[PDB]
Design a protein around this ligand. Structure first.
Ligand SMILES: Nc1nc2c(ncn2[C@@H]2O[C@H](COP(=O)(O)OP(=O)(O)O)[C@@H](O)[C@H]2O)c(=O)[nH]1
Ligand SMILES: Nc1nc2c(ncn2[C@@H]2O[C@H](COP(=O)(O)OP(=O)(O)O)[C@@H](O)[C@H]2O)c(=O)[nH]1
Ligand SMILES: [Cl-]
Ligand SMILES: [Mg+2]
Ligand SMILES: [Mg+2]
Lengths: 160, 160
C-alpha cells in the first residue's frame, strides 16, 4: 500500500514501467464493460477498467482494491481468469503531455451480474456493455482495449 | 530504453514495483543455472539470472538485452517458455537497507549449450549448474529461486 504524492508519481512515470491489472468484464448477454475515461492517458476513449499495483502491494490485494475502486464490487483474484501480460505505451501522462507512460499489464477476465456492480464516476463518465464485434469496429474504443479481442494481437502475449 | 541515474533508480525502487524477467536456464544434461549474487537484494544467495525492464522498453527488447547482459548470449523472447508471473519482496535494495524492493517477475525457461554462454562477472562471482532436486535441497539458493522448481506462488500458466 502506497499512494504516491504527485511529485513522486511524476518521477516514477517518467522513469519506469507501471504495473497494472486490466479487467475484461462480461455480463449476462456476452457483452464487455467499457468506460469512457476522464483521465489521461487514453483520455476520452472507451477502455476496460484497470489500474496500477502499488509498492509492496501483492497482486491479490491489488485485485481486491482495484475491483472495488473501478467496479464498486470487491472481488478476490480467484474470481479472475488470468489473461496474459500486455504492454501499453502512451505519449502522455496522468498530469500532462510532457512525458510518456508505460504499463506492463496483467489481464483478467470474469463474468458478473450488472446489478452487483456499483459503477463509480471518478475514472469514467459513462459505461457501456459492448459486443466484441461492436467494440472492435469502433475507433473510440482505444486500440489497447480492442487488442484483448483480436486473435492476431494475442499471438506472442506471455500467458496466452 | 532508459538506464536510470542512481538518484532516479532509488526513487523508483522506494516508490513502485519493478518489473523483471527471470531466466530458468537448462543445459543439455537437464541441470539449471544459478549464480552467486554480488548485488543486493538477495546478496550472497544463489539465484537464477534475471533483471528489470526499463522505461519504454518492450518485453521483446528487454529479453534480448537481459539474456545478453546476464548470460553473454543474446536470445529472442520466442526462445523462452513463459513460466508464470511471480512476486518477490525484499527488505533491502541495491543501495543498502533504507527501503524495500518489490518485483513483479515474468519467468522464462529455455535450454542452452554451456559452451555458447559467456558468463559475466558483474552480477555473480560464481556459477553452478544444479539438478532441480539439488537446488531445492540447498538453503543457500534463495527461496524465490527455489520456487520456480516447485510448485506455485505462481500467477498464470507455464507456456505450451
Ligand atoms: N498521485 C497519484 N495518483 C495516482 C497514483 N496511482 C494512480 N494514480 C492516479 O489515480 C487515478 C486512478 O488510478 P489507476 O486506475 O491506477 O489509473 P489508470 O491507469 O488511469 O486507470 C488516475 O488518475 C491515476 O493517474 C499514485 O500513486 N499517486
Ligand atoms: N543505476 C541503475 N542501476 C540499475 C538500474 N536497473 C538495474 N540496475 C542495477 O544494475 C544491476 C543489474 O540489474 P538487474 O539485472 O536488472 O537487477 P537484479 O535484480 O539485481 O539482478 C543491479 O546492480 C541493479 O541494481 C537502473 O536503471 N539504474
Ligand atoms: Cl550443455
Ligand atoms: Mg483505472
Ligand atoms: Mg540481474
Amino acid at each position: 500500500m502506497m499512494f504516491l504524492r504527485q511529485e513522486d508519481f511524476a518521477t516514477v512515470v517518467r522513469s519506469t514501467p507501471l504495473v497494472s491489472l486490466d479487467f475484461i468484464v462480461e455480463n449476462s448477454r456476452g457483452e464487455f464493460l467499457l468506460g469512457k475515461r476522464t483521465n489521461r492517458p487514453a483520455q476520452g476513449y472507451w477502455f476496460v477498467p484497470g489500474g496500477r499495483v502499488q509498492k509492496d502491494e501483492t497482486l491479490e490485494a491489488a485485485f481486491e482494491r482495484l475491483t472495488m475502486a473501478e467496479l464498486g464490487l470487491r472481488l478476490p483474484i480467484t474470481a479472475g481468469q488470468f489473461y496474459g501480460v500486455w504492454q501499453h505505451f502512451y505519449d502522455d501522462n496522468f498530469s500532462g503531455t510532457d512525458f510518456t507512460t508505460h504499463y506492463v499489464v496483467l489481464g483478467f477476465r470474469f463474468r458478473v451480474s450488472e446489478e452487483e456492480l456499483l459503477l463509480p464516476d471518478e475514472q469514467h463518465d459513462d459505461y457501456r456493455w459492448l459486443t466484441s464485434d461492436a467494440l472492435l469496429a469502433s475507433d473510440n474504443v482505444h486500440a489497447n482495449s480492442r487488442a484483448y479481442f483480436l486473435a492476431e494481437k494475442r499471438t506472442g502475449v506471455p500467458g496466452l
